[PDB]
Design a binder for this molecule. Structure first.
Ligand SMILES: CCCCCCCCCCCCCCCCCC(=O)OC[C@H](COP(=O)([O-])OCC(O)COP(=O)([O-])OC[C@@H](COC(=O)CCCCCCCCCCCCCCCCC)OC(=O)CCCCCCCCCCCCCCCCC)OC(=O)CCCCCCCCCCCCCCCCC
Ligand SMILES: CCCCCCCCCCCCCCCCCC(=O)OC[C@H](COP(=O)([O-])OCC(O)COP(=O)([O-])OC[C@@H](COC(=O)CCCCCCCCCCCCCCCCC)OC(=O)CCCCCCCCCCCCCCCCC)OC(=O)CCCCCCCCCCCCCCCCC
Ligand SMILES: CCCCCCCCCCCCCCCCCC(=O)OC[C@H](COP(=O)([O-])OCC(O)COP(=O)([O-])OC[C@@H](COC(=O)CCCCCCCCCCCCCCCCC)OC(=O)CCCCCCCCCCCCCCCCC)OC(=O)CCCCCCCCCCCCCCCCC
Ligand SMILES: CCCCCCCCCCCCCCCCCC(=O)OC[C@H](COP(=O)([O-])OCC(O)COP(=O)([O-])OC[C@@H](COC(=O)CCCCCCCCCCCCCCCCC)OC(=O)CCCCCCCCCCCCCCCCC)OC(=O)CCCCCCCCCCCCCCCCC
Ligand SMILES: COC1=C(OC)C(=O)C(C/C=C(/C)CC/C=C(\C)CC/C=C(\C)CC/C=C(/C)CC/C=C(/C)CC/C=C(/C)CC/C=C(/C)CC/C=C(/C)CC/C=C(\C)CCC=C(C)C)=C(C)C1=O
Ligand SMILES: CCCCCCCCCCCCCCCCCC(=O)OC[C@H](COP(=O)([O-])OCC[N+](C)(C)C)OC(=O)CCCCCCCCCCCCCCCCC
Ligand SMILES: CCCCCCCCCCCCCCCCCC(=O)OC[C@H](COP(=O)([O-])OCC[N+](C)(C)C)OC(=O)CCCCCCCCCCCCCCCCC
Ligand SMILES: CCCCCCCCCCCCCCCCCC(=O)OC[C@H](COP(=O)([O-])OCC[N+](C)(C)C)OC(=O)CCCCCCCCCCCCCCCCC
Ligand code: SF4
Ligand code: FES
Lengths: 75, 217, 279, 61, 58, 44, 102, 198, 42, 102, 57
């Protein structure tokens, strides 16, 4: 036809499990628990950070070969 | 901020410093204009309402914070020379590739995609496929290489690291030329009586720990 | 092997033939024009030296009746007998002579070519159907699609009279009135864009209208089965309610309305299969 | 070869197509594109379009 | 050795039904292509390299 | 959206008819998974 | 085509045989079978909220008439609790680093 | 103690018998569906225990149960269910092979069709090449042999002739009667040609 | 008799709007093009 | 984890005081600050020879410290009023404008 | 809160203040690095001269 835009869900996926409604409360509990674990560590990292400069935070740079990084003035 | 292009460096006693200052002042206008444009974009985005800005800021405007940082760092280093790039290959190889991917140095022709498409063209010319398929299987690998080449923002972080390293190297090298005259007398004696290419900053720390461990104390 | 030369020939082909987009050879050499110009399509896929070859005939309008089929018969009887065309009924009832009568898919016999001598009139085959000969397409793919819809009365249960007629009444007779008059001329199908793109998986306006006629037949008790047969893949869904299947019907039928009602029944059929099947 | 047959200027694929495609393709971009874009652009400038000039640029050597 | 037909829209005269239906179709396809093209353009102009110096090479 | 997009691809592009609806329904699953992943990560 | 048609046939037959071997090689066949069923379960039996309630209202579980509000309450509570925890963590961090600033 | 064994056996018997009840419906629906995408109406309209039926049929034919937990009637019902699932697996293999042959014929037809479309300015060839003719001949021979093999099943023979033979008819309509046409379609122009008004 | 038909409609509309928001960045413009046509302060 | 970490922990009172003093300085010490930024823009003055910028930096910091002292009684009163308004804020533009005129 | 103009005044002024503090730090660190390197070089040369440390590579 020429009229296909509807917000109504497709009846193909509108089926239902034989033991009640679609498993949503279980999956939303799992998602909330996952969200608490995930948005519980980024909060910990965000608010417990400070930036310090001491001349002790610096360490000698090294190449991929392990030896110290020294670049000559004229290469 | 409207820095005049002519530099005040001697250019006959500190050639490296004069060249660096000339390159810094020469490209200052373009990078300053781009920085101003990016800052205006950030300000106007902050000025937005709800999901149009002031809510998704600066968390979702991360592609222009990076651009502003790269622009400022590259504004400090007017021009990067190929000699100074190779040194950073000691730390990170393919740094030239990252700089090409981030800094518009040249036109990144998809060599890999073009040669893969030519490989498809060879097979499509053996068990003959239509030239429509030949054109499609030539465009496809070139498009793949273009997709995997452009948009690489990790190359921008690698270039930020390289630009910080090169800024520090140029600052230190600038001090070397300023004090080269003063240390000429001591350098001869130090080199002639201490046969070692190790840095004084590195040799002295060995002496410090050596005295710390084995000394009459 | 045969690829690169073929590509070069075809790219050079249409580009060198898009300029000459109508060949228009002339049957003869004429000077004074008191005659209507007929550009009749000509193509005989039996000799290697033949291509679509619009032929410009000149002939007096008065000498034959004002019908496209009469004009073609005048052309194919006196001037160029090599022309071919299907025609039997001469009354617009068999559907044999369906051709493209000056940019329109209508029956040749029940049709009137324009009387303006200055403007030439062009006659072409039915269009999006393979060309067997001049103006003679093969509607065998159409005919075959008529076989799939099971266009015969199918009764689930018998009648107790066993010696009388199926009770249909005049009102229920009118339901299939306006649906059974189709002459299977296939002029709407060849002018229906959904049929242009999917001649295989789309039955077509005429065939779906025949299916609707058998569905709304009062005596027929296989409505659900026929709906199921037509409500599969894009057999019916491909119709886009464009409305050109009704604009070009020489018999005045309404294939657009028939297919609209068929799609309405199908949409209800999908819903009815859930509401009426739950225990 | 490819003996194309095409009624120029009297056909759906031709001059009518040229006249029809721009007027219908540019419907939503011109009936919901311009208003939405204007709203999004001008919602920021509730008080002005001015660029707060950080990094000076008012100073000259 | 193949059967060549006619496109049946190169020869059919334009009709109001053709115009209306393909106008609706082109309206919807234009909306969708405008949305997708805006997304692609935002992707494209946000993946462009920063400006180099006048003589910068690597 | 996906239904009519696939219908548009099938109607006009002949070579899209090479894909049976088994493959198309696999593209449907992949597209739905990609959309869900995109929506999830854009908030992370 | 030409003599290369034999090479074309060999290549296509090799591709067909490799596909056939990969598909129904016992372990690969088993894992593809299980993956197909897992994909069906994921796509078709996703945790929806809207579904056809064919059963009469005297038969529908109260767990199904309130699952929408349970889901909405859980999600909204999680969001507001995350916001409150972020505020509390911000004030705690500020107070802690003010105490340790001295 | 044997919780794992008890759960495995009850799960297998439950799924197997439940899908055995709802198996003839699925097979009948697959019979109604065209050979092109026989699994359609399950991807689109209702997946009424189709994928579950395939998966658990393969499991039942490739798993084992402990008859200690089963009763006599339970074991008889389970064995009948397993036989029905195995028959469904064989039926699915048959319809899949028929569908793949249908798609072979449809690939031939699409190769012909792409050479006639007006959008095909890429390659316009008047005469079909040799290998496509050989493929047409071989596929028509295979289709004739398939029809002959289905002589004991008139309904299946009719379905195959209606569905698979339709694209053979389409290939017939797409080619002129020139060159080796009588030889290529010699097997087709005996019985099934007249089925499509030829 | 679909349950939560209003909720399903709202969820589909919200998902479409969010996707078009993030895939197109329509509401999050870049004003570097508008920077030249602006009057600076200070 | 993407927002930059804080270096110096500022209380609310200290942050508001620094805000208001910085605004006053930019409205008062604008010329010295601009001169200092002019010196600190080139490679020499920013990286290689910060010794040159010492005097301009000292002038700017002295001006900022004079602003922070705000020895005027009216300045002290208006600043305290603006600080009270800001702390109640956990608006204030009229109070700020009244203060800055002093 | 204040007007965005005042907030950006504060932003640029605080940028200048941080830059001034970094300037103080840079000057002090550079002069003392010069002194430190001179002292370390003198210590190494004196140690090697008086036969107190043997440097091999
Ligand atoms: C957890 C809840 C499981 C549940 O309720 O299962 C019974 C229930 C069976 O429903 P039914 O109406 O009896 O039978 C129809 C099923 O399609 C018939 O499906 P089934 O009975 O074959 O499914 C058995 C089910 C397990 O079910 C049991 O074991 C039933 C007994 C549980 C106690 O298996 C699984 O859940 C394992 C596969 C999970 C794949 C996840 C992929 C993520 C990517 O399973 C489901 O509804 C499947 C839910 C899958 C959710 C996937 C979400 C992806 C996002
Ligand atoms: C002047 C500055 C031009 C470069 C700006 C680069 C920055 C940027 O955001 O570019 C994307 C930017 C789209 O973001 P926008 O500025 O919000 O769009 C303004 C209009 O809504 C117009 O938005 P639009 O969607 O019409 O974008 C123009 C064009 C994409 O733009 C172009 O093709 C470049 C045209 C100018 C050269 O895209 C299309 O026409 C979409 C449909 C066709 C398929 C692609 O496109 C342009 O600036 C092109 C004009
Ligand atoms: C804005 C306006 C409104 C919205 C319009 C939306 C669509 C816009 C255009 C989309 C273009 C891309 C596409 O899908 O094209 C399919 C479309 C395929 O059409 P078809 O249904 O196969 O029928 C055309 C022929 O009858 C039969 O063609 P053939 O037998 O030569 O072989 C066709 C085959 C050959 O493949 C190609 O030609 C590759 C095309 C992409 C490069 O094409 C494909 O398999 C398409 C694959 C596309 C993959 C994604 C790229 O591609 C072309 O027609 C390509 C034409 C240009 C390339 C050849 C030119 C001569 C070279 C010497
Ligand atoms: C304009 C330029 C623009 C450029 C843009 C560029 C953008 C960036 C690049 C983007 C690249 C990615 C985009 C495409 C993604 C394609 C994803 C994909 O593979 O979908 C599977 C999809 C499968 O087809 P389907 O639609 O699912 O058909 C299923 C129907 O039931 C039956 O359909 P049917 O009737 O057609 O039956 C035939 C079907 C039947 O073939 C099959 O069924 C084979 C299995 C296919 C996947 C499973 C499908 C099962 C049904 C759906 C449920 C899936 C659940 C799991 C989902 C995960 O296919 C074949 O027989 C073809 C030959 C296959 C040969 C290889 C088969 C074995 C593979 C290895 C298996 C090893 C055991 C399992 C894994 C063990 C642990 C490692 O397509 C293919 O497999 C064909 C293309 C790839 C062939 C080789 C496969 C290698 C695996 C990676 C391929 C990735 C693409 C190529 C990368 C090359 C790198 C050098
Ligand atoms: C229900 O619904 C309905 C359907 O559906 C089911 C239907 O089917 C139908 C049936 C009727 C139909 C008409 C259907 C047929 C459909 C089509 C034919 C679709 C195609 C038509 C359109 C989409 C409408 C036409 C309008 C437009 C805008 C399409 C595009 C048209 C153009 C002319 C192209 C755009 C123009 C330009 C100039 C773009 C240029 C792009 C470039 C890349 C060129 C760059 C130029 C340069 C100078 C740079 C490059 C230069 C170089 C490289 C140097 C040169 C060197 C070289 C080597 C080249 C109906 C009625 C219907 O109702
Ligand atoms: C064949 C192609 C040949 C040319 C290749 C490019 C040559 C070149 O270097 O061009 C540089 C030029 C310019 O590159 P640039 O980034 O240096 O230009 C920026 C210049 N300033 C800063 C001054 C504005 O063109 C391009 O880079 C164009 C290609 C960009 C990458 C496009 C990727 C695909 C975008 C759509 C994605 C859609 C979804 C994913 C699909 C997969
Ligand atoms: C007016 C206030 C506007 C605040 C805008 C910045 C919000 C910062 C918090 C979000 C964040 O970082 O989330 C971390 C993360 C991820 O943030 P994200 O994904 O949004 O940002 C990108 C993050 N990375 C870099 C990882 C890609 O979690 C979430 O976003 C999930 C939800 C967390 C909600 C936390 C509080 C949200 C506050 C704004 C709610 C809406 C406006 C109304 C506020 C109240 C007004 C009285
Ligand atoms: C000669 C061939 C010209 C057209 C060449 C191809 C152009 C389009 C390529 C991409 C098509 C993408 C969509 C698609 O698949 O469409 C296929 C469809 C297929 O149409 P079809 O009728 O061939 O369909 C075949 C369908 N089967 C085989 C299943 C029965 O549409 C077309 O091919 C349309 C072709 C014409 C499009 C416009 C071409 C214009 C060329 C320049 C004309 C200049 C003069 C204009 C008039 C001036 C008057 C003064
Ligand atoms: S419905 Fe009309 S136009 Fe169509 S085939 Fe029948 S008589 Fe001809
Ligand atoms: S000859 Fe019968 S329809 Fe015209």
């Amino acid at each position: 036809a020429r009229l296909w835009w509807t917000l109504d869900p497709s009846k193909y996926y509108l089926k239902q499990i034989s033991s009640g409604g679609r498993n949503e409360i279980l999956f939303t509990v799992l998602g909330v628990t996952a969200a608490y674990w995930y948005f519980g560590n980024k909060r910990c990292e965000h608010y417990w950070r400070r930036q310090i400069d001491n001349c002790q935070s610096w360490s000698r740079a090294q190449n991929i070969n392990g030896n110290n990084l020294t670049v000559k003035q004229y290469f | 901020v409207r820095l005049n292009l002519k530099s005040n460096v001697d250019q006959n006693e500190y050639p490296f410093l004069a060249k660096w200052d000339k390159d810094m002042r020469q490209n200052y206008e373009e990078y300053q204009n781009r920085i101003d444009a990016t800052t205006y974009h950030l300000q106007r985005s902050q000025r937005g309402i709800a999901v149009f800005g002031e809510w998704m800021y600066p968390r979702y405007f991360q592609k222009d914070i990076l651009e502003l940082e790269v622009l400022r760092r590259k504004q400090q280093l007017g021009k990067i020379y190929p000699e100074e790039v190779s040194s950073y290959t000691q730390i990170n190889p393919d740094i030239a590739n990252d700089l090409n991917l981030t800094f518009n140095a040249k036109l990144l022709w998809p060599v890999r995609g073009m040669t893969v498409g030519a490989g498809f063209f060879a097979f499509a010319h053996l068990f003959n496929l239509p030239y429509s398929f030949r054109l499609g299987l030539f465009v496809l690998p070139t498009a793949v290489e273009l997709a995997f080449t452009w948009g690489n923002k990790t190359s921008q972080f690698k270039s930020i690291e390289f630009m910080d390293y090169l800024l520090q190297y140029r600052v230190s090298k600038a001090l070397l030329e300023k004090n080269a005259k003063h240390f000429a007398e001591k350098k001869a004696a130090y080199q002639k009586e201490i046969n070692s290419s190790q840095s004084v900053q590195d040799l002295y720390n060995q002496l410090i720990t050596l005295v710390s461990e084995q000394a009459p104390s | 092997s045969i690829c690169l030369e073929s590509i070069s020939g075809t790219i050079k082909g249409l580009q060198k033939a898009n300029y000459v987009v109508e060949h228009n050879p002339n049957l003869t050499s004429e000077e004074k024009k008191h005659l209507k110009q007929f550009l009749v399509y000509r193509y005989n896929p039996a000799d290697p030296h033949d291509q679509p070859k619009y032929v410009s005939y000149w002939c007096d309008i008065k000498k034959f009746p004002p019908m496209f089929l009469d004009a073609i018969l005048y052309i194919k009887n006196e001037l160029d007998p090599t022309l071919s065309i299907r025609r039997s009924c001469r009354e617009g009832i068999c559907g044999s002579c369906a051709v493209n009568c000056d940019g329109l898919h209508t029956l040749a016999c029940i049709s009137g070519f324009n009387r303006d001598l200055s403007k030439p009139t062009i006659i072409t085959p039915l269009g999006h159907m393979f060309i067997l000969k001049d103006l003679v397409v093969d509607m065998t793919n159409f005919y075959a699609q008529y076989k799939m819809i099971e266009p015969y009365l199918k009764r689930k249960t018998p009648k107790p009279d066993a010696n009388k007629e199926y009770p249909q009444s005049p009102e229920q007779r009118a339901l299939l009135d306006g649906l059974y008059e189709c002459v299977l001329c296939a002029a709407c199908s060849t002018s229906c864009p959904s049929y242009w793109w999917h001649p295989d998986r789309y039955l077509g306006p005429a065939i779906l209208q025949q299916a609707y006629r058998w569905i709304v037949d009062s005596r027929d008790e296989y409505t659900q089965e026929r709906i199921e047969r037509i409500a599969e893949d894009v057999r019916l869904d491909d119709c886009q309610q464009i409305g050109m299947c009704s604009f070009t019907c020489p018999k005045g039928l309404n294939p657009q309305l028939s297919l609209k009602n068929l799609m309405d029944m199908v949409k209800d059929f999908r819903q009815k299969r859930i509401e009426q099947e739950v225990l | 070869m490819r003996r194309i047959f095409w009624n120029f200027k009297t056909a759906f694929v031709g001059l009518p197509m040229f006249s029809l495609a721009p007027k219908n393709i540019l419907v939503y971009p011109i009936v919901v594109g311009v208003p939405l874009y204007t709203f999004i652009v001008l919602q920021n400038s509730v008080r002005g379009f001015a660029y707060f000039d950080e990094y000076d640029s008012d100073v000259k050597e | 050795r193949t059967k060549l037909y006619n496109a049946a829209y190169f020869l059919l005269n334009n009709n109001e039904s053709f115009g209306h239906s393909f106008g609706i179709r082109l309206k919807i396809v234009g909306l969708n292509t405008w949305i997708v093209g805006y997304a692609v353009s935002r992707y494209y102009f946000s993946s462009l390299r920063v400006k180099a110096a006048q003589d910068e090479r690597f | 959206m996906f239904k009519e997009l696939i219908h548009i691809f099938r109607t006009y592009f002949i070579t899209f008819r090479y894909l049976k609806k088994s493959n198309i329904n696999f593209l449907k699953n992949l597209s739905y998974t990609l959309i869900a992943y995109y929506l999830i990560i854009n908030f992370m | 085509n030409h003599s290369c048609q034999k090479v074309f046939e060999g290549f296509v037959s090799a591709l067909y045989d490799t596909s056939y071997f990969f598909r129904n090689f016992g372990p690969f066949k088993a894992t593809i079978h299980y993956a197909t069923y897992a994909n069906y379960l994921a796509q078709n039996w996703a945790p929806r909220v809207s579904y056809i309630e064919t059963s009469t209202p005297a038969y529908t579980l109260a767990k199904n008439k309130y699952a929408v509000y349970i889901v909405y309450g859980l999600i909204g509570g999680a969001l507001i609790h995350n916001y409150m925890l972020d505020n509390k963590a911000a004030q705690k961090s500020q107070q802690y680093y003010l105490k340790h600033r001295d | 103690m044997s919780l794992v064994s008890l759960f495995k056996n009850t799960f297998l018997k439950s799924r197997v018998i439940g899908l055995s009840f709802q198996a003839q419906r699925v097979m009948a629906q697959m019979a109604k569906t065209d050979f092109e995408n026989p699994d359609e109406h399950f991807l689109l309209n209702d997946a009424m225990k189709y994928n579950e039926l395939v998966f658990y049929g393969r499991l039942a034919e490739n798993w084992s149960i402990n008859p200690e937990l089963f009763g006599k009637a339970e074991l008889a019902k389970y064995n009948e269910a397993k036989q029905t699932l195995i028959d469904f697996n064989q039926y699915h293999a048959l319809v899949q092979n028929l569908h793949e042959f249908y798609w072979e014929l449809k690939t031939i037809y699409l190769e012909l069709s792409r050479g006639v479309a007006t959008s095909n300015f890429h390659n316009k060839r008047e005469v079909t090449h040799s290998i496509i003719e050989s493929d047409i001949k071989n596929s028509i021979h295979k289709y004739i042999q398939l029809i002959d093999d289905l002589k004991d099943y008139p309904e299946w023979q009719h379905k195959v002739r209606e569905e698979i033979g339709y694209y053979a008819h389409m290939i017939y309509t797409s080619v002129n009667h020139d060159g080796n046409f009588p030889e290529i379609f010699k097997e087709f122009n005996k019985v099934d040609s007249l089925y499509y008004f030829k | 008799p679909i349950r939560n038909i209003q909720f399903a409609r709202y969820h589909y509309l919200a998902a479409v709007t969010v996707f078009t928001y993030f895939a197109t960045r329509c509401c999050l413009l870049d004003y570097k093009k508008y920077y030249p046509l602006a009057s600076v302060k200070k | 984890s993407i927002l930059p970490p804080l270096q110096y922990t500022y209380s609310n009172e200290e942050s508001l005081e620094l805000l208001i003093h910085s605004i006053k300085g930019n409205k008062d010490c604008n010329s010295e600050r601009k001169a200092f930024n002019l010196c600190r823009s080139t490679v020499l003055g920013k990286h290689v020879e910060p010794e040159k910028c010492l005097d301009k930096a000292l002038v700017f910091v002295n001006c900022f410290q004079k602003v922070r002292r705000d020895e005027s009684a009216a300045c002290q009163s208006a600043f305290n009023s603006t600080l009270e308004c800001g702390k109640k804020y956990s608006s204030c533009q009229s109070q700020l404008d009244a203060y800055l005129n002093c | 809160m204040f007007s965005d103009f005042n907030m950006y005044e504060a932003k640029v002024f605080l940028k200048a203040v941080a830059d001034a503090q970094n300037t103080f730090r840079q000057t002090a660190q550079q002069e003392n690095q010069l002194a430190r390197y001179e002292s370390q070089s003198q210590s190494l040369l004196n140690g090697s001269t008086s036969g107190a440390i043997s440097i091999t590579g």
